[model samples]
Target: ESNVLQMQCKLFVFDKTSQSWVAVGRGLLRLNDMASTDDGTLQSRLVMRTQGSLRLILNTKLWAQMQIDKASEKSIRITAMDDQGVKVFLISASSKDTGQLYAALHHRILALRSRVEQEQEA
Candidate 1:
């Protein structure tokens, strides 16, 4: 269950164009990569594959990456920053399976990090 990806889940990211959140344009969301934080804490950084629009002029696919230092069963909030150092509030999930989604996401992140550590040591 940890390795399984719950694809096709409704995904939305902040659209700076309209100054609101918008659903991905015909694209689904998925986990891309997971990195561990060096802040001497048990926090895991995460990257998500998602899409967004530019003020309705252009639609583009982008990465919604952030550090998940903490999360809850129903919701996970993140303060994401792009390469330009611009920051925004990024979060996702629904009440239908919010708990499962949250758990699965964190589980996979930790599992992958663990696997990578094991590989590095070998």
Candidate 2:
């Protein structure tokens, strides 16, 4: 997998009962490639597992419409919505590396968009 990419993050999920985001668990977010051999080309996926017990939490692939709303005083926020969307996941780093983490995610997202473009264009 060539070292892969990862970062430390604090996970959170929203609850109507709580009326706010509740802490899930702190964990390391790992990025990996999916073996979609039928498609003729591979793709990337985001798999985040909680620390301590190391339970799998957020698992999704990067797509074009994947909206990323970063820290806008910023709480090192990482947020994403699921397909047709009702679910949500929040990841917070710190004022320090939040920018780095977000930048990497966003850049990769754009790269995939470019891949889609290439698929249609050429």
Best by lDDT: 2
lDDT tens digits by residue: candidate 2, 6-105: 8787877766566788887788887776655676454666788887778998787767657677744334344454434536656777655567666767
**Which candidate number maximizes TM-score?**
2
Which residue pairs does candidate 2 place in steric collision?
A: none
Candidate 2 Cα errors over 4 Å, as ranges: 16-19, 34-42, 72-86, 117-122
Model 1 TM-score relative to the real fold: 0.38
Q: How far is candidate 2 from the true structure (C-alpha RMSD, Å)?
A: 3.9
Each prediction's whole-model lDDT (CA): 0.43, 0.68
Model 2: residue 99 alpha-carbon error in angstroms: 2.1
Judged by whole-model lDDT over C-alpha atoms, candidate 2 comes out at 0.68
User: What TM-score does structure 2 among the candidates reach?
Assistant: 0.68
Candidate 1, residues 1-122, lDDT tens digits: the string is 01233333344456576887665432243433333356322333333444453123222122223344333453454445434432443344555445655665556556546656776767
